[PDB]
């Protein structure tokens, strides 16, 4: 029952800043993490296959890092596209859990 929590439950940024989101695991999920982003009423599309190796198709500004119990998604630049809600989920063992959700809006 590994429960995860995100630190910036709210968020607000400009159109050129570099923002960073973090997730804290209640257990040692060695490397396995992923970061979905949900647009205005869509299905959560994933951004990274793992804590580090991002997923093909997404822009390179997203850069994940971490291991074990402390992970960090970093949007290296904001654009009109990079706005929504960002969840984070472990897929190490069942049952799977999600972060509280990080809402990102304009400054």
């Amino acid at each position: 029952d590994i429960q995860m929590t995100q630190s910036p439950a709210s968020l607000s940024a400009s159109v050129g800043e570099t923002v960073t989101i973090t997730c804290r695991s209640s257990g040692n999920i060695h490397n396995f993490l992923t970061w979905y982003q949900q647009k205005q009423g869509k299905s959560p599309q994933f951004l990274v296959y793992n804590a580090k190796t991002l997923a093909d198709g997404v822009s390179s500004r997203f850069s994940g890092s971490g291991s074990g119990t402390q992970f960090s998604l970093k949007i290296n630049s904001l654009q009109p596209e990079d706005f929504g809600i960002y969840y984070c989920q472990h897929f190490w063992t069942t049952p799977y859990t999600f972060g509280g959700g990080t809402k990102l809006e304009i400054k």
């Binding site: 396995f32 992923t34 979905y36 869509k42 299905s43 959560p44 599309q45 994933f46 990274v48 296959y49 793992n50 997923a55 989920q89 897929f91």
Partner: peptide, 16 residues
């Protein structure tokens, strides 16, 4: 309610 399957690491979600 979402239906999903295992992609490489993450899930794949269909419309709700």
């Amino acid at each position: 309610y979402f239906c999903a399957r295992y992609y490489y690491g993450p899930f794949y979600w269909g419309q709700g």
